Amino acid sequence: STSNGRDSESKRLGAKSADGQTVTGGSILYRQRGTKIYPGVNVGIGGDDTLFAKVDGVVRFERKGRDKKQVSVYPV
Amino acid sequence: AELKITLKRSVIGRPQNQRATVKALGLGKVNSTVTKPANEAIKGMVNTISHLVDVEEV
Amino acid sequence: MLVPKRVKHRREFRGKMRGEAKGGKEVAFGEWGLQATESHWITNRQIEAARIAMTRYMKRGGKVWIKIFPHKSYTSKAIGVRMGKGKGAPEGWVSPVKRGKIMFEIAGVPEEVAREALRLASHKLPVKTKIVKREEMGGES
RNA sequence: UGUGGUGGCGAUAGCGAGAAGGAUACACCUGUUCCCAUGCCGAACACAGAAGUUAAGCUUCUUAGCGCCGAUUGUAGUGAAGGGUUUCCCUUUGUGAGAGUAGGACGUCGCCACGC
RNA sequence: GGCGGUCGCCUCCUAAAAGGUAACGGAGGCGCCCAAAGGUUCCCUCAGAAUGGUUGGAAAUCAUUCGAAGAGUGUAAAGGCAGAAGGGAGCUUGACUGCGAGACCUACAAGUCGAGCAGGGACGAAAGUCGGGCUUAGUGAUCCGGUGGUUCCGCAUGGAAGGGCCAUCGCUCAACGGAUAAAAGCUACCCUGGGGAUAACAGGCUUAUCUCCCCCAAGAGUCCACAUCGACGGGGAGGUUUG
RNA sequence: GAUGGAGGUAGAGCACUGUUUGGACUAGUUCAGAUAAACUCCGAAUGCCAUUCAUUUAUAUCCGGGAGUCAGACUGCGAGUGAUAAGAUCCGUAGUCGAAAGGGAAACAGCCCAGACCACCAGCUAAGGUCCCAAAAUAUAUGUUAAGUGGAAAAGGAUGUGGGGUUGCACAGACAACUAUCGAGUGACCCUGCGCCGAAAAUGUACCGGGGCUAAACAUAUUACCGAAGCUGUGGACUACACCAUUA
């Protein structure tokens, strides 16, 4: 006799490629709610905030001024 | 330079990375030995296994 | 009995004391302290019993500081009821105390009255205790 | 050099208090004819100007009251490896904070234009 | 076991700083809404407090000064947002058609993001942005039936009847991966197969409760805490009671 | 091992939201002190993702034939339900059992040590031990305990004993005792080692396994020995791979 007892399915959010890893065009980098991380050089934002590569290159997580983070992709 | 490494304890009852470290050095049974070069990687393996092992700088 | 007005949550977890006081380990407002040397839960009724005993002994008043507040609630089920359904109904309030915490303070009264009062307060409590004074800083009157 | 403009760097670049200045430039200031404007108002935005003034913005300089950047060594925690009752506590080995402090700090690097 | 509740989907805590993670564990929401509350171009900055002012009061509406956010964000909560995703004004229908390199999630079936190419457009001087809404709930396989299209087939031939392909409609099939188009009770009058995978006595473990023993001592006892009783509180033993 | 990174737990903090104690004040803001699972200005150890990297090591991936399993249990550690009860229940992480013989723990699935191809009347060790049952020290140096504590249990109580500190009063005479002298010391506090009381259950001593123990107990050091189907020695079987000259 309780009125709790329900939850929703987990969504598998987080980072999907690492710093210093080479990546092909279109590959997901980060799933989020809102911009915890921001898009940088050669990276796009999806409709529900996912971050993706536009170009093949290496992934680098950086610092955006004082309190924000960025992902960039740099081709060789 | 080199180190003689002798196995003095058993691997029953230990976790998996310690078993696999004893294997990566090439140590089979109790009192079997091995000789390796002195590196920063081999010293890390010896430091993970120190409670099971005797080491002599040779 | 002390009770918190307006809790945000009706039930909560209990653990995990793992003694060492985080906060007041020195006398702040009085001259004499009562410091717990074991870690345990301390309830509403134990505090009021100790306070009444401590004040009754000090004719001509003085002052007394209670430095321990019951923030966390209890729950419990009833006899004759099998395990299973959700948490019981809340019955009680407590504060966890860890070793080192000073719990009462007295002033305006010489040693022996203060020492007797702190002796009578400790027999009402489930912890071992010491009696401490303000020792030495840049200024202690 | 001085001033106008436009850029990098985590405010060590900021806030407040105080002083000074009009060479060109920047401003305030003066008007609504004409391009445009007010859910009322030429206040703003838009345009035509050049009487007046360094009072305000702007620039330079002093100031560590508020923010900001902060080590060192000590603790709290905790990888590995062991011991008592196992609620909890302890000993070796490695790692090590948050507070609290000694100190830093009243910016630094670059391009263009004009004047000296 | 029955009675009670629950059965799909979303957000938080549990959850041990990647992801994942139980319980008849602790808290809440959904089964839509908007022709603008969508696209795009310009412009704007909040909530309060203090001071004055006629009706007007604490608090309607005016003026100034402080004010990094203490507001708002269609709807729950978390994560985001003052280079706005918050708030005004003009023009509009991209709430487009054919698609799709590559990733994410995952037993399957499904679910999610996507640069870029082609056709034809909206807004803007341009650069450009636009395949609904700050993000994540607002949904239901297949079979069968209805409506519209079609350069497909059509049992000797020409038609027709009928079928296929494309677009869409008919679900509280809510026991929400959906048994059939269609479904409630009694057995003390009972039968077979299994299970100590599961309930009742006795045992075992545990000791909340119960019986007993204590510590402190306000008090009662005319005076006097302890002859006798012992408030508010605290600590144990036992294994006969209810669990 | 080195280098980079994503992320808010253990701390601990009060800037934000709840909960909260004292003081000054006034409108008629302030100074201090706490607290949290759904608080955060902060923030580890470890785990996780990578790398034309390094050193050792031998696996990993792809296609196909054949399965079995979908009741787990206890013990560290960290959480929920419970009463921070259960050999309880439900998750995470490591091991043993399951499917594991052998030594220790009296007897003992799951604890401590260790993984049995076979033969020996050979040797060295592990955990645990060395007075007799029962193999090996009636070992060595220095101390503590008198309670059979060792060999079950709390709040509280007490001139029991060991060690280290802080001091009041003492031969211009102390504390105690004696009326109305005496001729060395005497009180009061702190932390600490080991003991004492508190301590009552049902067939028969009846938790040292027994005898028995004043060390054959406890603390700190030191060296010998015993001890397993672990390792070594001598010989045999079977398999693989390198050697070797065909002969395997």
- All domains of chain A in start order, with CATH: 14-74 (2.40.50.100)
Nucleic strand D near CB of residue C18 (< 7 Å): yes
Amino acid at B9: R
The shares of helix, strand and coil residues in chain A, as percent rounded to the nearest 5, are 0, 40, 60
User: What is the DSSP-derived secondary structure letter of residue C115?
Assistant: H
Structure tokens at B41: 């990687």
Q: Which tokens belong to A59? A: 């992934």
* Rounded Cα distance, A72 and C81, in Å: 61
The gap between the terminal CA atoms of chain C, to the nearest Å, is: 34
Q: Structure tokens of A56?
A: 């093949």
Structure obtained using: cryo-EM
Pairing of strands C129-133, C32-36: antiparallel
Residues 6+ apart with CB under 8 A from C92: C43, C44, C73, C74, C76
In angstroms, the CA A51 to CA C92 distance is 51
Task: Give exposure, A30-56, as e/b (b: 16+ Cβ within 10 Å).
Answer: bbbeeeebebbebbeeeeebebbbeee
Return the number of other C-beta atoms located less than 10 Å from residue C54's C-beta. Answer: 24
Q: Could you list the residue range(s) of the whole structural domain that residue B48 is in?
A: 1-58
Provide the positions of strand E that have an atom within 7 A of a protein CB.
4-7, 9-14, 18-21, 24-29, 78-81, 85, 101-106, 112-115, 133-136, 208-209, 215-218, 231-235, 242-243
Cα–Cα distance, C129 to A69 (Å, whole number): 52
Q: Which bases of strand D sit closer than 7 A to a protein CB?
A: 10-11, 76-77, 80-82, 87-89
Would you tell me how many other CB atoms lie within 10 Å of the CB of residue C85?
10
Residue of A nearest to C85 (CA): A1
